[PDB]
């Protein structure tokens, strides 16, 4: 495979309000032949292009001839914008050097078309609104007023709307990942097991997702609970490391999050109905008869 010409550029970046960056263009002859190439850029009133090489044409180079070709331009619009340049090789001009073949195939003129982003002026955000309408074979209508213009920036603010019901989950690239026994500590282990548990629910439910890594995550969870045997308390509560703190309670998101799935996890490896009632009965105790227990 071969081309003797290829265009390298200045990737602008998501760029500042003032759009006069540094756009250049460089094609390089890797064929041994010195060929004139007539070049220009296709522009628009969407921006304030400025001719750097106004009067003279970037003309002609030879095999591996280095030339930098740039213009100035200070746009008006914001958002991603494509920039079209074109470079063509013409005939009957054996005058830029000794000679110029200038006889390519269907890939005759080199043309490049570049979506660059411009970042607008100021820190970016939005404001939205949320509206429902539920006529039951009837009619309902709503009005929504959309205004918070304090300390405003030029031509910066716009808006839109939509509504949706989507079906057909395509895919699962959002799905996979993994971590492990937290090298730094047993403290971050609470955030380990907690989402680890409901991965049971996904193996089969998903039909896009990777059940095996979640069928691995159970391989882990077959150890996960064993730590919770250690992270529990004797009276029944649970802590990061457990008992040795008697007449108190503890957090319950994690135990509440899990104690169901301990009971969904009570199929593969056996946890008893003792482990759940003891969890429970610890809870019933903390309830006062009248007060929302302190």
């Amino acid at each position: 495979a071969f081309q003797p010409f290829f265009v390298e550029l200045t990737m602008p970046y998501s760029v500042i309000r003032g759009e006069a960056f540094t756009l250049k263009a460089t094609v390089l002859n890797y064929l041994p032949k010195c060929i004139r190439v007539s070049v220009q850029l296709e522009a628009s009133p969407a921006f304030l292009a400025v001719p750097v090489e106004k009067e003279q044409a970037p003309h002609c180079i030879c095999a591996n001839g280095r030339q930098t070709v740039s213009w100035a331009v200070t746009p008006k619009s914001l958002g991603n914008v494509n920039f079209t340049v074109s470079a063509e090789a013409l005939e009957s001009q054996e005058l830029c050097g000794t000679e110029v073949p200038s006889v390519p195939e269907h890939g005759r003129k080199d043309t490049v078309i570049k979506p660059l982003l411009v970042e607008p002026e100021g820190l970016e955000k939005e404001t939205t609104f949320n509206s429902l309408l539920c006529p039951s074979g009837g009619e309902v209508s709503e009005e929504l007023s959309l205004k918070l213009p304090p300390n405003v920036v030029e031509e910066s603010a716009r808006a839109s709307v939509s509504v949706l019901g989507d079906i057909l989950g395509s895919a699962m690239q959002n799905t996979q990942n993994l971590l492990q026994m937290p090298y730094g500590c047993g403290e971050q282990n609470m955030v380990l097991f907690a989402p680890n548990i409901y991965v049971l629910d996904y193996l089969n439910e998903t039909q896009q997702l990777t059940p095996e890594i979640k069928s691995k995550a159970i391989g882990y969870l077959n150890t996960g609970y064993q730590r919770q045997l250690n992270y529990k308390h004797y009276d029944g509560s649970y802590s990061t490391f457990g008992e040795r703190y008697g007449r108190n309670q503890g957090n319950t998101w994690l135990t509440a999050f899990v104690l169901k799935t301990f009971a969904q996890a009570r199929a593969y490896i056996f946890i008893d109905e003792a482990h759940i009632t003891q969890a429970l009965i610890w809870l019933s105790q903390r309830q006062k008869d009248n007060g929302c227990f302190r």
Partner: protein
């Protein structure tokens, strides 16, 4: 029906097949007013969003993002490229909300970091996730601090020519009642 002040009214329709259909429409009015009307059976919800930029020149505010860029000016032919920027920050409202999450640290228009990768790579202050975004820096999870710390890191000049307006990378959330506490400084080499 999507009706506005400017004699404008765009209609849409929905069904079992338009179920999954996103219906995007914008308008250019400085007036923001959105009357709507629908019919049919069952309930359904549409949503809005209004994009806009802010922070033209905000005034100072409680929090201290302590950033310092360089030796006070380029004022030399080699500069505008290599200048290590030292950032030194801690808000005081730090009580009983969460672990240390928030940060933002990005590049200006035309500036590429390398060692910034490596200085973040080094830092770890008694506890740390060694977390990184590859355009930002995340060494924060720890216990409540009255201190700050700092760092310093440079770029290389990706943009030779740059119109005058800065970049500033601020996120600032400490307590619900007070103003949200911004502190700032740009790059001076210009």
């Amino acid at each position: 029906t999507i009706q506005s002040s400017g004699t404008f009214s765009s209609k849409f329709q929905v069904d079992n097949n338009n179920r999954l259909l996103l219906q995007q429409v914008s308008l250019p009015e400085l007036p923001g007013e959105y009357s709507m009307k629908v019919t049919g059976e069952g309930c359904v919800y549409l949503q809005t969003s209004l994009k806009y930029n802010i922070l033209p020149e905000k005034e100072e505010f409680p929090f201290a993002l302590g950033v310092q860029t360089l030796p006070q000016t380029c004022d030399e032919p080699k500069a505008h490229t290599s200048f290590q920027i030292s950032l030194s920050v801690s808000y005081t409202g730090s009580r009983s909300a969460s672990n240390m999450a928030i940060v933002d640290v990005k590049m200006v228009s035309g500036f590429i970091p390398l060692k910034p990768t490596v200085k973040m790579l080094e830092r770890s202050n008694h506890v740390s996730r060694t977390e990184v975004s590859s355009n930002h820096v995340l060494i924060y999870l720890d216990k409540v601090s009255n201190q700050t710390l700092s760092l310093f890191f440079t770029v290389l000049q990706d943009v030779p020519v740059r119109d005058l307006k800065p970049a500033i990378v601020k996120v600032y959330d400490y307590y619900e009642t007070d103003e949200f506490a911004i502190a700032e400084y740009n790059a001076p080499c210009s």
